User: What shape does this take?
Amino acid sequence: LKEFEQKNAGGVGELEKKAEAGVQGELAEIKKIAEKKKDDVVKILIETVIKPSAEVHIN
Amino acid sequence: FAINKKAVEQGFNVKPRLNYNTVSGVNGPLVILEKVKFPRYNEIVNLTLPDGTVRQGQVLEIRGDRAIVQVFEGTSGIDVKKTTVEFTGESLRIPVSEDMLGRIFDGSGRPIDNGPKVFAEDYLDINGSPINPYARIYPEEMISTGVSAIDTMNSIARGQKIPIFSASGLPHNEIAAQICRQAGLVREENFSIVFAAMGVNLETARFFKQDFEENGSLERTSLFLNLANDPTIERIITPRLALTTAEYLAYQTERHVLTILTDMSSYADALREVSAAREEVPGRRGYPGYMYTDLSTIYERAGRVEGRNGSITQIPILTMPNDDITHPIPDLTGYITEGQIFVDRQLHNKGIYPPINVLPSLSRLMKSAIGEGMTRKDHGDVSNQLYAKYAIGKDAAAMKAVVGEEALSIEDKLSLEFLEKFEKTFITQGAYEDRTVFESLDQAWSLLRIYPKEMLNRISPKILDEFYDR
Amino acid sequence: GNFKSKLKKAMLSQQITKSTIANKMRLKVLSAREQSLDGIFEETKEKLSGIANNRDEYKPILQSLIVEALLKLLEPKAIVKALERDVDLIESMKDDIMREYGEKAQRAPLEEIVISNDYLNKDLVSGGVVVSNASDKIEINNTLEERLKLLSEEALPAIRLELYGPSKTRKFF
Amino acid sequence: EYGAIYSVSGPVVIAENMIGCAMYELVKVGHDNLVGEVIRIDGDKATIQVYEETAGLTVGDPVLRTGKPLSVELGPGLMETIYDGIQRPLKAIKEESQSIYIPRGIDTPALDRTIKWQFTPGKFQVGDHISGGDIYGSVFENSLISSHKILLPPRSRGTITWIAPAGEYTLDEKILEVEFDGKKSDFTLYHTWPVRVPRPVTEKLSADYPLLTGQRVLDALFPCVQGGTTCIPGAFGCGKTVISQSLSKYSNSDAIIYVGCGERGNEMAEVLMEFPELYTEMSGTKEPIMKRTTLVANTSNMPVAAREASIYTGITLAEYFRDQGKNVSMIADSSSRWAEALREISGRLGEMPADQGFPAYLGAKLASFYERAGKAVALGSPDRTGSVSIVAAVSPAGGDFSDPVTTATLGITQVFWGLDKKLAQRKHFPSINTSVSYSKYTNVLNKFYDSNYPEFPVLRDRMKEILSNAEELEQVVQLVGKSALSDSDKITLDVATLIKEDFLQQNGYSTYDAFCPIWKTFDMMRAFISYHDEAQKAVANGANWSKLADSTGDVKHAVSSSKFFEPSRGEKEVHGEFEKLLSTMQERFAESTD
Assistant: This one.
């Protein structure tokens, strides 16, 4: 049992670091594709906000 | 694709909404408005108490210019001078997205796992239109749950709805956890599991969160929790949220879902409470007159579809009040559903796990899944033989306690031996023991060795001649 | 037999640690995505103000907003609660508003449009108005800082479809 | 002309400015034109019940009038179709809506208006006189429905001034002009009919021909007649579908109309998959049975108010097919769900309940429905006859027969088939309770029996006596023990167990016992009675029965395995085997009398 329990001592930091590295390539994608399409979304929603509809609820 | 790009283009639109600072009474959990300018039945509103705390409601009736609103989070503290409503101009909708898997939501479907919002792909009404019966296909499949009493005497075909009747104090929670941990198609364990618990204590929620975490299943599940101390009215919404999520997943991403509803008795109690607040005509024992339809619109959402591959299977857990199968809730639950597994109190007092008796349980779609090409050809009638012998054992034991042990022919002695062994070795099993249907059927045959071939009548002679001797 | 239990317990514990790490990993990605979205939704508000600091273009937008609120209200009387630096503009268009309300709806023009002596917050609110009826019991909040909040709730799917293209594994809508 | 919505609450609407509306008239509600039917009237206002989902209705929405009550469309193309409560085809709705949900506010014609039909003109010539109910043509619908017949609508008559020639047509092209006070009437291949007014008939007759179910117990002890009613009170899942399945599969009727009200919904998916893969022979083996059936489906999920309109629609079609001189049979599903819907709407309006909430007029709704059954002579010239034989199935709460729904049908029906729970739990199907069921059509079948099977009723009575005596004798052994039982009592109990294990177990589905013909049942009946008689005869002379038990040995096995004789092998085929069986049995008894 001592062997088994001490075998797991090194399985914490290594696993944590490996998992951290695994996704680390994803946040970069999020950031880099956020800046390409920011202007389009901003323009679209500003245009939507500015112009009202001016409609009457069909009775 | 263009079709994807147009279904959401209508989203880019802004629609302001009114604020009515005009309430004209409060009574029980209801609130009455006035001068509402074209109400809509089944709308959603946002009460803003004078304290500054927001709540939510839902209209139920609309006369000329009055709307009767029932509030979810109680009604105390409301005032007829400073409160403020705001009509959202829509029904109740849930934000869904296939990233819900692996998260926790509360009774109202909002995160409680210290995470962000859902960032949905589309909004869906919690209610849903019925499924065109011409566009439904019956299962023709089988799930191996690894429980002999469930996988041999009864059967479960994916796309089926099966309750679990169990009294209070029995380990139906453990049985459900085992089933969901230990279910796969008979030759997958890829069943995405949505889970909705309503009216439970903290210990039950902690236990369920624990079991799904150590089995590596928490990354493909979704939990809705409504504990015992949460507002009573919200217990009606929760199952609809869970089922809407399941329907989205299955019928629009092609994956097989399995749903659990932890306590339908609490749902029935909440229905009765909200009904009695109004003055609806009651059914027997005080429950509402229309409870049957309300339960039906919850259960009848499972099965398969012609053009899709997903299939959602239900395992609602139900608790009888006083171990009374004639109570309204079990009666309607088993009238709507197709089969049900029965957890027995008597077997529990003898330390038999799972304490499942087989006489009062049934499985409607067993006769289709079993047969040839999936299991041995004996499965169809070995179950019948075991049923008959168990029923004979019961009344033989009953007779033994009246006349003594004088009129018990050899038939009765064999029946009692069979009854003892069939419970002490066959039904009983461990909490982590799998049992493929082949092994269970071999053991079942082993228990018919007691009887000589000449009086196993329910079974076919052909099967006997080819298996009774091997 | 004792060994089986005292080994299974440690097995379950290490499995729980694995599951906990794998779980908490996803929250970082989700938070990153929603933070990126918050970036867009925060950098927009600095252009609404820019438009609000432009008289040549702000007048028609104000008129349209007032007309929309009045049309949704459908009353013969109205009260307007605008900012301090806009009452001058509003006072210069009290004829077009009445005529256009009388036109779009099939009734006669409004009777009066009394601008409230109250005001709004110079900082929280940038432009827009709030319109209510005579008794001041029904309101339609139509500030430029309100419309954005509504738009940031019913436009999430239309924003995901644009920032990540058609989602995979969804095949029937 | 248009009204306006004024109040909405559950499945009930109130519309103002409705002056011309009339009781039970049909209306169109909302902007999607949902279907409604006025119920009450108070000056301008008029309460309405909606046959769809009420959600999103806005006070002020328009409401229309139509001026005619809820009616179905009767004509060619009814066979093989599946309909919802208000007769909207489901195949067309799916294939045109490109979805699996039922889109609310959808409207499609009940009968396809584009298909082509072959029309064979009748015998009436121009200038003749024709009265409502007379055949003036025919149509070829299927290989099994060889000639669908065309009928003049009731309440319409005159002298025909133009009749179309043979050929092909659609559901629109007029094929007859009738002049009563002006040739203002044009008649196509179809016509409508209000659902709450029973179709007129010439005269009612007495049903005196048995309805062959296939199940042994039903045919033997509790027979039914072609044109009679019935009840099958369920007991919470005791194989009440096996009876309906067998009845639909093997009954000797020219058509079937299976109705589902409050159904589980999954069943329809099975009954519309099995039938196109099963066959029955009448004038040759015609592979499909679907060519003979129509289905009306309203699952427990679909709107409540449509439950009531799913049985009137079901039975009006049965009456229509009767008018063409065909023996039809309507197999209703749970009729207690209809009562539950009535209770729900009654409570919604607000009114005094009678029993357990049910409205006071429940007892009158049921009777006027069961009264449409029965043989009768159609209305018209060619003098044909038909019949309708409804078979309800009530679903009492719990398992008691004190339910107001149950106690109301037993007062009006003529046959009754209880169901037992424990028998179902033991896998003993059919699960009929032989001590409480009864049948009133037990003597009027004497003519048929005399024509065919003169000794049938005597054997039936003797078997029932055997079973009752066995029950009484066992009633004491539970507290006295089988010690003071004479030989005769022991033989009676043995024979009763043999019968309850062999004769009355149909084992549902197999290749041998799925449809036990009448003659096979009769021969088995005679064999069992002869066995018991000889067993009592041999022991009558003092010979001990205990030794006879294993001295005979093969007799019991022979009688218990006689049920395996394969039908369809010839009426004379198994007749000889059953003839020699009892001869060998009595020879063995005479020899084994030692």
